[PDB]
Amino acid sequence: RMYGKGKGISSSTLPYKRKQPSWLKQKPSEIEDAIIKLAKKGQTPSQIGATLRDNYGIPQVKSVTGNKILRILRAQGIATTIPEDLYFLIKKAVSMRKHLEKNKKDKDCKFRLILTESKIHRISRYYKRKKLLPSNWKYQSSTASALIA
Amino acid sequence: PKSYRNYSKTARNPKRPFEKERLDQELKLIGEYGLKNKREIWRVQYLLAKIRSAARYLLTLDEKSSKRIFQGEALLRRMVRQGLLGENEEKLDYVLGLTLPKLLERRLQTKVFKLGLAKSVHHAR
Amino acid sequence: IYIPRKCSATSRLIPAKEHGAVQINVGMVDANGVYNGKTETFAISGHVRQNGESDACLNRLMYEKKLLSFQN
Amino acid sequence: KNWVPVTKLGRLVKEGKIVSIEEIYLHSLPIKEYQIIDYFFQPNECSHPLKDDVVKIMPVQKQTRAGQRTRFKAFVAIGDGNGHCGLGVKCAKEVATAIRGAIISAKLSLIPVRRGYWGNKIGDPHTVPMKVSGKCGSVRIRLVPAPRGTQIVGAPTTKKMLNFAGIKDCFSSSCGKTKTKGNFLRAIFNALSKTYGYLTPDLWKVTNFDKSPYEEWSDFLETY
Amino acid sequence: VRMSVLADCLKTINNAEKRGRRQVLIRPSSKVVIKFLQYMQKKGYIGSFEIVDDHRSGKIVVNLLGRINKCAVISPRYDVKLDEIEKIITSILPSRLFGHLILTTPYGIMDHEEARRKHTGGKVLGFFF
Amino acid sequence: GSGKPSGLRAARKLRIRRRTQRWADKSYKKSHLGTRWKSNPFRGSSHAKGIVVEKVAIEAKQPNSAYRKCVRVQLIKNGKKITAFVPGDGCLNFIDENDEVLVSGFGRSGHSVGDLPGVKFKVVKVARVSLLALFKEKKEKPRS
RNA sequence: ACAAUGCAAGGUUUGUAUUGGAAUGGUGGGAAUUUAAAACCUUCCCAGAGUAACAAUUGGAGGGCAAGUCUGGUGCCAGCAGCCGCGGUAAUUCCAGCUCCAAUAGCGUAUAUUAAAAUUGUUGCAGUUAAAACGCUCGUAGUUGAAUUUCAAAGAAUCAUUCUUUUUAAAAUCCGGAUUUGUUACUUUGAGUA
RNA sequence: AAGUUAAGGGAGUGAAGACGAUCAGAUACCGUCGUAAUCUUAACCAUAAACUAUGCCGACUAGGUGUUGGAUGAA
Ligand SMILES: [Mg+2]
Ligand SMILES: [Mg+2]
Ligand SMILES: [Mg+2]
Ligand SMILES: [Mg+2]
Ligand SMILES: [Mg+2]
Ligand SMILES: [Mg+2]
Ligand SMILES: [Mg+2]
Ligand SMILES: [Mg+2]
Ligand SMILES: [Mg+2]
Ligand SMILES: [Mg+2]
Ligand SMILES: [Mg+2]
Ligand SMILES: [Mg+2]
Ligand SMILES: [Mg+2]
Ligand SMILES: [Mg+2]
Ligand SMILES: [Mg+2]
Ligand SMILES: [Mg+2]
Ligand SMILES: [Mg+2]
Ligand SMILES: [Mg+2]
Ligand SMILES: [Mg+2]
Ligand SMILES: [Mg+2]
Ligand SMILES: [Mg+2]
Structure with missing residues (x-):
């Protein structure tokens, strides 16, 4: 684990066969449409994937549709400006900051806030290095709260 | 200016000056081949040693490397000339197998002693 | 030129002062069950004996021959 | 020089049932009696004899209620000068005795x-x-x-x-x-x-x- | 974390040899590692090995002949010139008569002797005895 | 892990640590600090000439019992006062209370030698005659 | 140096005290030469060793470390001793003499330096307790960074191996044949260096 | 932890201090009393045998007895 002393290995691990299984009836177009609908309804990539797995009969959008789900969202144009994980981190940070504002003496929270900030800065940096974030994007503790939306 | 007439040490000293066995060996050598000091022995060791070093270096290179064939061959020839090897033992692995006796044999005094001329080594000298 | 002995299991090859290491000798059968004259041989190094894998190694060796039949 | 051999290997070696010490090395056998080693390296019959040396006689003290109590560790290297080396140790009260012990020990050790x-x-x-x-x-x-x-x-x-x-x-x-x-x-x-x-x-x-x-x-x- | 897969693999192999295993599961296969294994096989030290393809970094399992004394990586893959080789080999491997010092060389990976024969030295991966 | 970095491009760290650490080596520090020239009577030299100021005794380290015969001398070079032990069975009297003595080290760079407490120097010539020669006596006699 | 006897030891020969003829530099003087002129070098001719006075020293002999528990003197004094130590009336250590040992026309002492030093550690140190893991985490530079992209295949020689030849895709170029295809590190050949 | 600064708080404990003993002496150990501190609030401090005296990430190697927290199966 990047920050704790946590060393767990709980993980999804996908099956050997990566051409979709026989029982999968859904044609790709339908699944794409479903994905789009889910996106519209406010769900994030991971969440969307989960929904697809559970509510509909489909293991992996990658086996049914050549593309992964983020890619298809992008194609359809409903991709977030601000990437999933990063966004989540930002939200968490914001929450922490609110708590701090409320409740000044919380040392552990402060420590954890610092850690989350650091992680954001890593993630943020990575995104900048690609082209998902713009280069003009620092993350600010003052702004942050407004950013998430 | 200084002269350009360069000069060189012919003999290295021991290292460990009162090792018994070595000393005894040296003394034996002196006895046998009528030598004046340990210095003579040291000088001959040095002479031998350079050659040995060269041989070692050559062996580190492979056969039909130009250097090995040329320089090694030359060395071998020199050894032959000196009366260190002769007919049977001319292969560059053999020039390592030289010892001090081999070299001392070819000293003039020793030769003289061998080929009649004088009753002794000392006498020959 | 004494060529030392190769542990038949692990091939480690075993020196003079090993002791420990053993040359176990297995006697053959001839149809009836009676002791045939011949003897099939395994040297076992000390290390394996110390470990306790020795028995396993022996079993494997037997399997490789025909002497016993289960492997593990 | 005759000795009543105790161990089986020793007994075997007493007669000409074994060719060389090489054979015994091969089957990793525990040599117990130095007599065996002696038999294998005699000045007669054999080529290279076992030249020995007392490389170190270190004195070694126990310190009882009444003063010191010195023993002498002797170390000896024993050697064919060709294949076989041995290294023995013995702590004993007198020096000579210690040395003697050490030679036996060295013989027992003796390795190719x-x-x-x-x-x-x-x-x-x-x-x-x-x-x-x-x-x-x-x-x-x-x-x-x-x-x-x-x-x-x-x-x-x-x-x-x-x-x-x-x-x-x-x-x-x-x-x-x-x-x-x-x-x-x-x-x-x-x-x-x-x-x-x-x-x-x-x-x-x-x-x-x-x-x-x-x-x-x-x-x-x-x-x- | 991982850094040099190959090094780790070699360490594992060495450990297996020490124990006296027979089989051994080299856990992330790598082209380089595979090449190394092949080389080893060629010079007799290793038996068969069944590079098992997952759908990821593969696993190898490798069949051992009880024959390796040590095998190793020499990290910092030092560039090594053809003249510089001899000293390096003297430093490393136990005898001039045997052991092998494996270089990655612009003519694929090969041992020091091979390199000498060719003419090109290169970067030095590892070795065995 | 080793402790040290063994990267291919690591050289800067490797050099730099060594450069800093060298200074922990006592001998190296002695060689390369500038206080050598400052804080040393001979000022980086084999010997030095000093006129004598006082013939003096120095009591030895506790186990041994002697009064070692020293000479407190003033270096002409440096204006430094130093005790120099004088060898010989009776070689304090071979020198005068004001004699141009030539004094060497004792054998241990600065570090003091043997029974003597803090006398780091060995007078080895008086009025240009060799102390050793005088001691032998068959060789020479002190000119004055 | 050599040979005689005398003496010695060894399984007749080596070794070592009397003699005594051979050898020869050194040293001295002439030349020949050398050299700008001399001087040396070498060269020849006269001189010319037996205590071959034509005289080997230097530093050591407790250990480290080769060599004395030899003789007198000193008596925790003087002194020696790089270090450990020696000296308090047997000192194998001082001061001597004798004998021995080392290196020897050299041999000591000092200061520096290299090696010894894997005691600065790239190769190559150590960090529970010996000196040494920052109180802890984050963190910039720094160093380090999973796997993945043409794998392979066949023929000839040699003593399972070595060295060689041939083809297995795509694009541009040339009259179905034939021939170019990321950058740098790295490496190989060169070139050019007093 | 002590310590510092400022507000409260102030029971017990209790550096200081005071006696009582103890002892040749006792400015200590034992006892009685007893400020500072201990407590909170708001700052400083930035150190401890801050000790697993074991830097962190990684791979491998060997069994058993457990134990905290989940998951899987079966009784
Ligand atoms: Mg981290
Ligand atoms: Mg993990
Ligand atoms: Mg001029
Ligand atoms: Mg000695
Ligand atoms: Mg001295
Ligand atoms: Mg005496
Ligand atoms: Mg004396
Ligand atoms: Mg040094
Ligand atoms: Mg070295
Ligand atoms: Mg160290
Ligand atoms: Mg410590
Ligand atoms: Mg720590
Ligand atoms: Mg960084
Ligand atoms: Mg890689
Ligand atoms: Mg506190
Ligand atoms: Mg406080
Ligand atoms: Mg207050
Ligand atoms: Mg109160
Ligand atoms: Mg109270
Ligand atoms: Mg601290
Ligand atoms: Mg600590």
Whole structure:
């Protein structure tokens, strides 16, 4: 684990066969449409994937549709400006900051806030290095709260 | 200016000056081949040693490397000339197998002693 | 030129002062069950004996021959 | 010189049931009696005799309620000068007795050491075959094989041991306290021992086994 | 974390040899590692090995002949010129008569002797005895 | 892990640590600090000439019992006062209370030698005659 | 140096005290030459060793470390001793004499330096307790960074191996044939260096 | 932890201090009393045998007895 002393290995691990299984009836177009609908309804990539797995009969959008789900969202144009994980981190940070504002003496929270900030800065940096974030994007503790939306 | 007439040490000293066995060996050598000091022995060791070093270096290179064939061959020839090897033992692995006796044999005094001329080594000298 | 002995299991090859290491000798059968004259041989190094894998190694060796039949 | 042999191997060796000490080494047998070793290396019959030396007689004190109580550890290296080296230790009250004990110990130890070659094989092996390294206590020594004309580059003690072993040409190292002579000696011995137990491309061959003295002559031992 | 897969694999192999295993599961296969293994096989030290393809970094399992004394990586893959080789080999491997010092060389990976024969030295991966 | 970095491009760290650490080596520090020239009577030299100021005794280290015969001398070079032990069975009297003595080290760089407490110097010539020669006596006699 | 006897030891020969003829530099003087002129070098001719006075020293002999528990003197004094130590009336250590040992026309002492030093550690140190893991985490530079992209295949020589030849895709170029295809590190050949 | 600064708080404990003993002496150990501190609030401090005296990430190697927290199966 990047920050704790946590060393767990709980993980999804996908099956050997990566051409979709026989029982999968859904044609790709339908699944794409479903994905789009889910996106519209406010769900994030991971969440969307989960929904697809559970509510509909489909293991992996990658086996049914050549593309992964983020890619298809992008194609359809409903991709977030601000990437999933990063966004989540930002939200968490914001929450922490609110708590701090409320409740000044919380040392552990402060420590954890610092850690989350650091992680954001890593993630943020990575995104900048690609082209998902713009280069003009620092993350600010003052702004942050407004950013998430 | 200084002269350009360069000069060189012919003999290295021991290292460990009162090792018994070595000393005894040296003394034996002196006895046998009528030598004046340990210095003579040291000088001959040095002479031998350079050659040995060269041989070692050559062996580190492979056969039909130009250097090995040329320089090694030359060395071998020199050894032959000196009366260190002769007919049977001319292969560059053999020039390592030289010892001090081999070299001392070819000293003039020793030769003289061998080929009649004088009753002794000392006498020959 | 004494060529030392190769542990038949692990091939480690075993020196003079090993002791420990053993040359176990297995006697053959001839149809009836009676002791045939011949003897099939395994040297076992000390290390394996110390470990306790020795028995396993022996079993494997037997399997490789025909002497016993289960492997593990 | 006659002695009533106790052990089976010894008994066998009493008569000409064994060719060489090589055979006994091969089947990793525990030599108990020094008499066996003596029999294998006599001045008559045999070629190279066992030249010995008291490399160190260190005095060693126990400190009882009434003063000191000195014993003398003797170390001895014993050596064929060709293949077989041995290294014995004995702590005893008198010096001579200790020395005597140590020679016996050395004989018991006596190990075959593989001499090999540097570079390529010409007449008769001379150096160690490969870099072998023993440790005992702090002192760890790494004999490295050398070319022919080199002597044993190494400490006096190491030189002494190596001549006995029958290595002519080597390169010593020595990490650790070499002033502690006994340990150094032990390390050297260990290194020497390692020479057979190394497993070179030479020895990939799986040559079928020889029969041990105990099965080949079991019938002859039933008489006694 | 991982850094040099190959090094780890070699360490594992060495450990297996020490124990006296027979089989051994080298856990992330790598082209380089495979090449190394092949080389080893060629010079007799290793038996068969069944590079098992997952759908990821593969696993190898490798069949051992009880024959390796040590095998190793020498990290910092030092560039090594053809003249510089000899000293390096002296430093490393136990005898001039045997052991192998494996270089990655612009003519694929090969041992020091091979390199010498060719003419090109290169970067030095590892070795065995 | 080793402790040290063994990267291919690591050289800067490797050099730099060594450069800093060298200074922990006592001998190296002695060689390369500038206080050598400052804080040393001979000022980086084999010997020095000093006129004598006082013939003096120095009591030895506790186990041994002697009064070692020293000479407190003033270096002409440096204006430094130093005790220099004088060898010989009776070689204090071979020198005068004001004699141009030539004094060497004792054998241990600065570090003091043997029974003597803090006398780091060995007078080895008086009025240009060799102390050793005088001691032998068959060789020479002190000119004055 | 050599040979005689005398003496010695060894399984007749080596070794070592009397003699005594051979050898020869050195040293002295002439030349020949050398050299700008001399001087040396070498060269020849006269001179010319037996205590071959034509005289070997230097530093050591407790250990480290080769060599004395030899003789007198000193008596925790003087002194020696790089270090450990020696000296308090047997000092194997001082001061001597004798004998021995080492290196020897050299041999000591000092200061510096290299090796010894894997005691600065790239190779190559150590960090529970010996000196040494920052109180802890984050963190920039720094160093380090999973796997993945043409794998392979066949023929001839040699003593399972070595060295060689041939083809297995795509694009541009040339009259179905034939021939170019990321950058740098790295490496190989060169070139050019007093 | 002590310590510092400022507000409260102030029971017990209790550096200081005071006696009582103890002892040749006792400015200590034992006892009685007893400020500072201990407590909170808001700052400083930035150190401890801050000790697993074991830097962190990684791979491998060997069994058993457990134990905290989940998951899987079966009784
Ligand atoms: Mg981290
Ligand atoms: Mg993990
Ligand atoms: Mg001029
Ligand atoms: Mg001695
Ligand atoms: Mg001295
Ligand atoms: Mg006396
Ligand atoms: Mg004396
Ligand atoms: Mg040094
Ligand atoms: Mg070194
Ligand atoms: Mg150290
Ligand atoms: Mg400590
Ligand atoms: Mg820590
Ligand atoms: Mg960084
Ligand atoms: Mg990679
Ligand atoms: Mg506090
Ligand atoms: Mg407080
Ligand atoms: Mg207050
Ligand atoms: Mg109160
Ligand atoms: Mg109270
Ligand atoms: Mg601290
Ligand atoms: Mg600590």
